[PDB]
């Protein structure tokens, strides 16, 4: 639970060896028919990041490269990206309030590589600043391809910011240069500032369930979900308010919004559970309440506040927006120069990732720069500087717009 570094994975890397080189192993995960893998999601790690007076950051045995009495202080975290070029737009949803970024380049595909800056194309509005140059061809074709290919990849670094950390030519099946890669991600990647004593909040992302058949009714049960901190550090056992929570159906007033808070026990931390919520990673929040409400799949997209919080939540929405004048990065000369990105039509489905929550976007009135919308469910107020409008243009989603709360 320390760093939310991102990664940009196109087709055919070999992904379990590189991610498990930087996350150790996979978590025990479950409850199939999950959510479609182009939606919002988060990563994790079963490792940590450290050193041993050593460029090498091994796995937690203390001798095997050599000694160095590892600092059992923190745990590394991560954000997932499977190895196909589809993984653009939900990652650019994730490329706003994460921590850093990996940058994946193969040599298996086209060597005048099309996809990487087709992938990395929000280096201005949101944050995209900490990367690495990472060659993934040591296997098939030797030093001629890599020889011209380092000139290829240094033909990327000029105004498109592709120079954050220089070339690492590897195949992660050998796990090579992970001493040098770990030295880069210790030293050459910093840790950005946070806030500590702020009142903590969370929007719920990835719910779970812990009452499989075969136990007693006297067990402690409740609602476990997933999340990651935007502010504060969340302790155990207080008035943890969720402000509308359930969709308040047939709500006739304003004070007919229900006061519902909870408590908390589990905050999963790979071996333990530090009861103050360690940010910079996936936090394993489990609520006290025993309903049909939260511990089902019913709850994704609600706030974590306290008694007497500030945001009042209704549907009155007006947004100021603009668009993108092509489909971002995609330009194929074999009959693909008309992937047209059309203006906001009335009553059209969208994806409005306000902050970091996927609710589908409905619209009601269209001007050239502002729009009055109404949304599919009651949705909290998070930020005005980004309202990440996405929209159907192909089989999966792509992001099209940037918004502003008015």
């Amino acid at each position: 639970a320390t760093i939310n570094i991102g990664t940009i994975g196109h087709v055919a890397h070999g992904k379990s060896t590189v991610v498990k080189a930087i996350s150790g192993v996979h978590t025990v995960r479950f409850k199939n028919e999950l959510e479609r893998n182009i939606t919002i999601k988060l990563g994790y790690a079963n490792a940590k990041i450290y050193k041993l007076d050593d460029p090498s950051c091994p796995r937690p045995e203390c001798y095997r490269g050599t000694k160095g009495n590892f600092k059992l202080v923190r745990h590394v975290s991560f954000v997932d990206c499977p190895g196909h070029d589809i993984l653009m737009a939900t990652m650019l949803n994730g490329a706003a309030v994460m921590d850093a970024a990996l940058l994946l380049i193969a040599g298996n595909e086209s060597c005048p590589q099309p996809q990487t800056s087709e992938h990395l194309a929000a280096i201005e509005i949101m944050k995209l600043k900490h990367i690495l140059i990472l060659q993934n061809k040591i296997d098939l074709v030797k030093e001629s391809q890599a020889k011209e290919q380092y000139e290829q990849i240094l033909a990327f670094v000029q105004g498109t910011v592709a120079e954050g950390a220089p070339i690492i030519p590897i195949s992660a099946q050998l796990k090579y240069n992970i001493e040098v890669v770990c030295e880069y991600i210790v030293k050459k990647i910093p840790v950005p500032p946070r806030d500590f004593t702020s009142e903590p909040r969370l929007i719920v992302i990835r719910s779970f369930d812990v009452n499989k058949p075969g136990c007693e009714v006297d067990d402690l049960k409740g609602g476990v979900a997933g999340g990651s901190i935007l502010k504060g550090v969340l302790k155990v056992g207080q008035e943890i308010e969720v402000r509308p929570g359930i969709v308040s159906k047939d709500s006739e007033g304003k004070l007919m919004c229900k006061p519902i808070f909870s408590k908390i026990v589990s905050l999963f931390a790979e071996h333990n559970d530090l009861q103050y919520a360690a940010p910079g990673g996936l936090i394993g929040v489990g609520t006290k309440i025993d309903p049909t409400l939260c511990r089902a799949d019913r709850m994704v997209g609600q706030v974590l506040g306290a008694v007497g919080a500030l945001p009042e939540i209704f549907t009155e929405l007006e947004i100021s927006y603009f668009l993108l004048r092509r489909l971002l990065g995609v330009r194929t000369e074999g009959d693909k120069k008309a992937a047209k990105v059309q203006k906001l039509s009335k009553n059209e489905v969208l994806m409005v990732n306000i902050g970091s929550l996927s609710t589908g976007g409905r619209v009601s009135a269209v001007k050239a720069d502002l729009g009055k919308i109404v949304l599919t469910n009651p949705v909290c107020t998070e930020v005005g500087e980004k309202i990440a409008l996405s929209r159907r243009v192909e089989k999966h989603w792509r992001l099209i717009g940037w918004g502003q709360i008015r």
């Binding site: 040591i138 220089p166 690492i168 050998l174």
Partner: peptide, 16 residues
């Protein structure tokens, strides 16, 4: 980028 010629000698002379 000295890391690349470090690979070019040692890594490819010893490993893949």
């Amino acid at each position: 980028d000295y890391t690349y010629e470090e690979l070019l000698n040692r890594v490819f002379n010893i490993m893949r």
